[PDB]
Amino acid sequence: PAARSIAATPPKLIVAISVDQFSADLFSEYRQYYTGGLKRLTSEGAVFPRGYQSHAATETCPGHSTILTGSRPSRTGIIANNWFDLDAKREDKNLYCAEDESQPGSSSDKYEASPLHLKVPTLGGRMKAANPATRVVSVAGKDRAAIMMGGATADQVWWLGGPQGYVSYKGVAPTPLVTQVNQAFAQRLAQPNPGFELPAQCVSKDFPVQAGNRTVGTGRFARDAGDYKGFRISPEQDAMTLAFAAAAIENMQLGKQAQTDIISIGLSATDYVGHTFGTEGTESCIQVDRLDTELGAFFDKLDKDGIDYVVVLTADHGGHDLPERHRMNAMPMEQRVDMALTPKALNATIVIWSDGPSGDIYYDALKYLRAHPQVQTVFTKAEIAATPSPSGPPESWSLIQEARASFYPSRSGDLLLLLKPRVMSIPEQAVMGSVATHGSPWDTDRRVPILFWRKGMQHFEQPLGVETVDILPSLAALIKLPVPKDQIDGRCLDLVAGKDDSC
């Protein structure tokens, strides 16, 4: 395409895409096979293959809270998907990251979605504050993804709610756009999927791996009509979320008005697939290839609409394969966390509250945990609080620096438990659900791609570490939106190769 600087003029539409659990490892592995939307981003864009969700709590909610805020979880206050507030009024002291726990009859298992917990504005919030004509849209496969990318002043915030399709906050009625999208969704759900044949690059991954009662490695997303769980844990939900995003962009004429609009898009399938099957089998392989194809179709659609958009694509965190397959592929030391460290057992052994066998622990320990062979280390609250907000290259932060980046005194635990590398925080069970997960302070789970693209820009690759908190000021520079450096943690990334500087 004709040469044109990414910063020549303000883009009219910002498109922010978070691919859930799209780790730099997974991205890098299949990079040579992209032919569609991911090929466009990597061959033509500003490529940061070593981006960081730099904090320790490498989960969905903290991760999405960084992408469009320029703020680490230490500032957003979103320190995990769940944390305890033992002073909460209601019986259930466990709080969901994206709920309003003050709502009566609520619990972490039955909550009302809300951006209440988020302490800073999003990029959309900042744009709207500077210019009220700005539209801010956020759609995703998970409520916490949509909510944290959009922020409290977003115009439209929609997420996949179950077999009924996309929904929003309590009281928000489906619009003509949404009923039409949900009509299309219901039609798709009502069709069988015979499955996807393997892309050439997925053929090598086609072998079964046992993990407890389960077998993974060979799935092709065959499913019955009406099987919503199958739909959810498949490339199909991403295709739908992108179709939704495209329909919203066109219906609302985003990017076709005087001011810049913004839409954030949380593509959730890669994460469900990674949890359910691990990351190196046919299932993830098919999903990443479909992701490439569907993003291609999406970008082509916006292109044909004549929209001047800039794209940023990244992930909310990385990911990690199930130990059972790692042990087959030259990593014999990979293992599952001792059942003794899970919440009930650990409390009985040690009086404490915890949501899993790592992360924040709350007093209603050090000696037992530090002696355990699978435990890397345990920080006290005071130790973390004593640590200054980290700066410098995120690829070489210490563990306590990582902890400090997702430390928020009024929400964080009294202890922070960190497991050794290559310990999967899902214990072995006769019957298992998820076989793999992220959430560790280690590089597989922190390291994510950050890709920027606008038609005609000059490609470059920058392999040194950057942070996802850098995304907001990078984008804000393009639209000449002032963002005081003292209100955020990130720095502006120059997106103009060579001498000129977008910052």
Nearer to Ca ion, 33 or 460 (CB): 460
Nearer to Ca ion, 9 or 131 (CB): 9
Q: Is 293 annotated as a binding residue?
A: no
Of the residues 14, 16, 20, 125, which one makes contact with Zn ion according to CB under 5 A: 20
Q: How far apart are CA 474 and CA 462, in angstroms?
A: 14
Identify the bridge partners of residue 378 per DSSP, sorted by sequence position.
Answer: 417
For residue 137, which amino acid is it?
V
Q: Is 326 annotated as a binding residue?
A: no
Q: How far apart are CA 210 and CA 55, in angstroms?
A: 32
Q: Does 271 bind Zn ion (CB under 5 A)?
A: yes
Nearer to Zn ion, 271 or 283 (CB): 271
Nearer to Ca ion, 202 or 496 (CB): 496
Q: How far apart are CA 123 and CA 7, in angstroms?
A: 18
Q: Is 60 annotated as a binding residue?
A: yes
Write down the H helix ranges in 366-468: 366-371, 381-385, 399-405, 443-446
Residue 501 interacts, among Zn ion, Ca ion, none and using kind-specific CB cut-offs from 5 to 8 Å, with Ca ion
Give the active site residues: 60
Contact 220, 197 (CB under 8 A): yes
Residue 496 interacts, among Zn ion, Ca ion, none and using kind-specific CB cut-offs from 5 to 8 Å, with Ca ion
Q: Residue 481, Cβ neighbours under 10 Å: how many?
A: 18
Q: Is 372 annotated as a binding residue?
A: no
Min. distance of Cβ 494 from Ca ion in angstroms?
A: 4
Min. distance of Cβ 492 from Zn ion in angstroms?
A: 26
Edge-first strand listing for the sheet containing 415-419:
352-354, 359-363, 415-419, 375-380
The structure tokens listed for 87 are 């002073």
Q: Is 134 annotated as a binding residue?
A: no
Nearer to Zn ion, 60 or 168 (CB): 60
Residue 289 interacts, among Zn ion, Ca ion, none and using kind-specific CB cut-offs from 5 to 8 Å, with none
Q: Is 271 annotated as a binding residue?
A: yes
Q: How far apart are CA 201 and CA 265, in angstroms?
A: 27
The region of 172-180, 246-254, 335-343, 491-499 touching Ca ion under the rule CB under 5 A is 491-499
Q: How many helices, marked H, and strands, marked E, lie in the chain?
A: 18, 20
Q: How far apart are CA 502 and CA 43, in angstroms?
A: 20
Shortest CA distance to 141 belongs to which of 313, 21, 288, 302?
21
Relative to beta strand 209-211, strand 214-216 is: antiparallel
The region of 249-257, 350-358, 374-382, 495-503 touching Ca ion under the rule CB under 5 A is 495-503
Residue 470 interacts, among Zn ion, Ca ion, none and using kind-specific CB cut-offs from 5 to 8 Å, with none
Q: What is the CA radius of gyration of the chain?
A: 22
Sequence-ordered list of residues with C-beta below 8 angstroms from that of 503, at least 6 positions apart, any chain: 473, 474, 477, 492, 493, 494
Q: How many residues bind Ca ion (CB under 5 A)?
A: 3
Site string for Zn ion, 51-70 (x = CB under 5 A): ---------x----------
Q: Does 461 bind Ca ion (CB under 5 A)?
A: no
Shortest CA distance to 413 belongs to which of 369, 355, 362, 366?
362
Q: Does 494 bind Ca ion (CB under 5 A)?
A: yes
Min. distance of Cβ 65 from Ca ion in angstroms?
A: 29
Min. distance of Cβ 459 from Ca ion in angstroms?
A: 13
Q: Residue 193, Cβ neighbours under 10 Å: how many?
A: 19
For residue 158, which amino acid is it?
W
Q: Residue 394, Cβ neighbours under 10 Å: how many?
A: 25
The region of 140-148, 248-256, 325-333, 489-497 touching Ca ion under the rule CB under 5 A is 489-497
Residue 461 interacts, among Zn ion, Ca ion, none and using kind-specific CB cut-offs from 5 to 8 Å, with none
For residue 416, which amino acid is it?
L
Contact 159, 142 (CB under 8 A): yes
Residue 283 interacts, among Ca ion, Zn ion, none and using kind-specific CB cut-offs from 5 to 8 Å, with none
Identify the bridge partners of residue 211 per DSSP, sorted by sequence position.
Answer: 214
Residue 316 interacts, among Zn ion, Ca ion, none and using kind-specific CB cut-offs from 5 to 8 Å, with Zn ion
Q: Is 445 annotated as a binding residue?
A: no
The region of 13-21, 80-88, 220-228, 470-478 touching Zn ion under the rule CB under 5 A is 13-21
Min. distance of Cβ 499 from Ca ion in angstroms?
A: 6
Q: Is 275 annotated as a binding residue?
A: yes
Residue 441 Rama label (left phi>0; alpha psi -120 to 50; beta): alpha
Q: Which residue has the tokens 């008005």?
A: 257
Site string for Zn ion, 291-330 (x = CB under 5 A): -------------------------x--------------
Site string for Ca ion, 381-420 (x = CB under 5 A): ----------------------------------------
Write down the H helix ranges in 305-372: 323-326, 343-349, 366-371
Nearer to Ca ion, 344 or 499 (CB): 499
Q: Residue 116: is it exposed, middle or buried by C-beta count within 10 angstroms (0-12/13-18/19+)?
A: middle
Residue 300 interacts, among Zn ion, Ca ion, none and using kind-specific CB cut-offs from 5 to 8 Å, with none
Write out the binding residues for Ca ion, residues 325-364 only, by CB under 5 A: none
Write out the binding residues for Zn ion, residues 374-403 only, by CB under 5 A: none
Sequence-ordered list of residues with C-beta below 8 angstroms from that of 429, at least 6 positions apart, any chain: 212, 339
Q: Enumerate the known binding-site residues.
A: 20, 60, 81, 142-144, 271, 275, 316-317, 438
Which segments are annotated as binding site for substrate? 81, 142-144
Which residues in this chain contact Zn ion in the complex, by CB under 5 A?
20, 60, 271, 316
What are the binding residues for Zn(2+)? 20, 60, 271, 275, 316-317, 438
Enumerate binding residues for Ca ion (CB under 5 A). Answer: 494, 496, 501
